Amino acid sequence: RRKVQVSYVIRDEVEKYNRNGVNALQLDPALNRLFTAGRDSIIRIWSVNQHKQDPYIASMEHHTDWVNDIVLCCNGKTLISASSDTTVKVWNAHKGFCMSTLRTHKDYVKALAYAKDKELVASAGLDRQIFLWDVNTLTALTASNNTVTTSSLSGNKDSIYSLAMNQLGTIIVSGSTEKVLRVWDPRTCAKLMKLKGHTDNVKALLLNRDGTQCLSGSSDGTIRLWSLGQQRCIATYRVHDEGVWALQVNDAFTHVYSGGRDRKIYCTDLRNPDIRVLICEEKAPVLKMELDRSADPPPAIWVATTKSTVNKWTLKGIHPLCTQPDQVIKGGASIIQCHIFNDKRHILTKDTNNNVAYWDVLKACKVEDLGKVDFEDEIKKRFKMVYVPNWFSVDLKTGMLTITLDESDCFAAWVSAKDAGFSSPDGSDPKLNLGGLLLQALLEYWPRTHVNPMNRVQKGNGYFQVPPHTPVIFGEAGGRTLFRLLCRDSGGETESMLLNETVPQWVIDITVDKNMP
Numbered sequence: 001r002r003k004v005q006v007s008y009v010i011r012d013e014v015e016k017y018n019r020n021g022v023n024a025l026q027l028d029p030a031l032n033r034l035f036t037a038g039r040d041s042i043i044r045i046w047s048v049n050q051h052k053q054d055p056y057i058a059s060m061e062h063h064t065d066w067v068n069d070i071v072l073c074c075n076g077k078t079l080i081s082a083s084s085d086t087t088v089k090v091w092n093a094h095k096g097f098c099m100s101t102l103r104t105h106k107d108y109v110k111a112l113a114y115a116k117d118k119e120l121v122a123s124a125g126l127d128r129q130i131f132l133w134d135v136n137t138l139t140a141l142t143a144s145n146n147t148v149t150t151s152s153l154s155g156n157k158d159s160i161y162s163l164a165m166n167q168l169g170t171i172i173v174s175g176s177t178e179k180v181l182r183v184w185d186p187r188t189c190a191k192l193m194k195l196k197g198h199t200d201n202v203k204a205l206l207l208n209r210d211g212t213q214c215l216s217g218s219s220d221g222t223i224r225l226w227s228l229g230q231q232r233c234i235a236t237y238r239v240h241d242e243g244v245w246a247l248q249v250n251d252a253f254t255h256v257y258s259g260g261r262d263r264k265i266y267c268t269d270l271r272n273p274d275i276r277v278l279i280c281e282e283k284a285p286v287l288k289m290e291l292d293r294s295a296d297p298p299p300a301i302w303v304a305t306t307k308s309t310v311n312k313w314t315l316k317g318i319h320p321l322c323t324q325p326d327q328v329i330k331g332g333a334s335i336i337q338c339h340i341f342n343d344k345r346h347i348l349t350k351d352t353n354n355n356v357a358y359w360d361v362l363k364a365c366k367v368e369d370l371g372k373v374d375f376e377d378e379i380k381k382r383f384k385m386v387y388v389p390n391w392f393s394v395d396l397k398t399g400m401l402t403i404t405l406d407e408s409d410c411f412a413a414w415v416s417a418k419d420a421g422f423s424s425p426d427g428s429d430p431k432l433n434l435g436g437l438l439l440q441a442l443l444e445y446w447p448r449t450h451v452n453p454m455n456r457v458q459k460g461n462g463y464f465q466v467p468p469h470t471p472v473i474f475g476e477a478g479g480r481t482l483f484r485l486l487c488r489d490s491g492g493e494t495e496s497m498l499l500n501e502t503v504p505q506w507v508i509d510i511t512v513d514k515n516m517p
Contacts, residue, residue: 002476003407004504007064008442008487010364010401013469015042016056017332020399022304025290026072026079028093033057034290034302034329035079035093036310037067040398043081045096046329048312055329062089062098064473064481065397069112071121073135080121080135082109084397085481088123088131090138100141103480104131104150111162113205115169120186124160124174132172132186153184155191164205164214171211171228175202181216183228197224197233203260204247215256217244223258225270237273239266246289250298257301259286265303267318279321280313300326307352308332308399334399339379344388344413345420345434347401350375358382361392361403362420362434364441364466388413391435406477407506410435411517422463436516437461439507442472446490446499449511474502 011019024037027048034046043060065084072079072093079093088102088109107127114121119135130153141148153172162175165186172186181195181202195214204217214226223244225235242261249256259265263285268276284305292300292312300314308331313322333351340347346367347359356370356378370378389412395402413434417423420432443449444460445468451458468488475481483502489495509515 002479004482004502005407005475005477006405006410006439006442006507007473007475008364008403008466009398009471009473010359010361010366010403011469011471013467015040015059015332015400017330018042018044018308018310018399019332020308020334020397021284021287021306022308022310023066024069024288025302025304025310026070027290027292027302028072028076029294030076031094033076034310035070035072036304036329037070037081039066040308040332040400041065041067041083041085043067043070043079043091045093046310048327050327058096060091060096060098061471062091062101062484063087064471064475064484065108068108068110071112071114073114073116073119073121074139078135078139080112080123080133082112082123082125084108085475086125086479087481088112088133090135090141100138102131102133102138102148105129106480110160113163113165113172115165115186116167118169120165120169122163122165122172122186124156124163126159128156128158128160128176129154130156130160130163130172130174130184132189151189153186153189155182155184155194161201161203162205162216164207166207166211167209168211171207173205173207173214175205175216175218177201179218181205181214181226193228193231195226195231195233197226197236198222200243203243203245206247206249208249208253213253215247215249217247217258217260219243219245223247223256223268235270237268237270239268239273239276240264246286246304248289248291248301250291251293251296257289257291259289259303261285265289265301265313267315277318277321279315281320282311283307308334332399335396335401336399337375338394338396338401340394341382342384342386342388344391345415346382346384347394348375348379348382349401359401362438363464364403364438364470388415388434405435405439407504410439410506411510417463420463432463433516436510437463438466439510441466442470442487443490443499443503443507443511445488446503446511447496448500451514474504 020039026035041063045057046055063083069082079091090100109125124130158176158178183192198218200219206215223237245260265279284307288304290302310329311325312327314326333353335349337350358367391413440461470487474483
């Protein structure tokens, strides 16, 4: 096996708004709900009743990296999600909780596809594999009915960035960095064809109801219409300056709604593409779009970008079209810059609202908000003339501070108690290991780490606690996420058992056996 690393996220208990871009959207027309799939790793449910003052319904937390795609299914009862954490999760979409986790992919899961008539979902990723999933089987998973059955489709020589199935469940198409569309019959798993034409990655796929026609969107800047009967490209539309990443098509299959790197969203007539309408220029690159299908013609389009806000643009008056969004779902700020001071303890950040903050990595918390001060000059001002060896790495993928601890350098940093801002019961100044202290705090609630007295049990490190809502994550270096939980839930029956299964020996040594190195 690979090395197992420990990670945690510095955040608030509720992250009501997306903290980074949004990769995918789904509408529940029945309940008037929108689901957003966050690059902050969180799925959120929103009310799209414009009457409502606050559209927030719920956060669906379980993934530990980008949620790249989602499929609402079973009359809105079930959500399936795909993530850069390598897993595909099954959720009760009405109640908003994770029911199971599928770990068959070896790498980032990039795309889902859905056949509504068969309630069949497919998942594809950077591992070049496609798996088919009967959702009604998946939702029937009891603890006794442990086993689940999946078939796979092979053929992709490269990483898969797009997947689509027709409504009937008779055609499935993948798009990849191979620059080709690969087509299978999902009933037989048989290779049907391989379609050439694109000169770059294929990022978006759409199929008509019959699975006879396909629209593809590519990084080469083109949209292509393919006939699967003739096994060829019948049309190529060039309506964008840069890569096309998101596509929708109306129910009649006559107009394509497209967006990507250049921010312009077009509604192009597929029969005469000289008739095209710029719906809007969006404030950032468009990642995904979801049509409102509550009427024909479609009244609006929901748009997801690399920013955290999600906008609804109306399409009425189609005969830039509109200046401002019709409906807006507020976005949170992403931390976009991070500086680790020479103490290897404090960090200064700047976010997308230009607000600057000072954080304590060891205690997993903010120290102060400085507001909109000069970021580079604040770094200079707070310069510390000390050396402390590196003992963690930082990453801003989620728009939040994620700290990772690795066996190789977690224990490198020793600091005196009084230099660290602590003291002992009897005026002492021992040497403390920062990583050792931190691991004990993250697993403070795990009863296997507790020590009975010589009245009150001794928990954690003796000097500080992390915030109890802090997510703690165990993962394979450059591999699969194994287990996630909140710090305060390690005492739970299932949580304790999974920590026994997942917490690696190098953490066990310090936290359970108390052998601070």
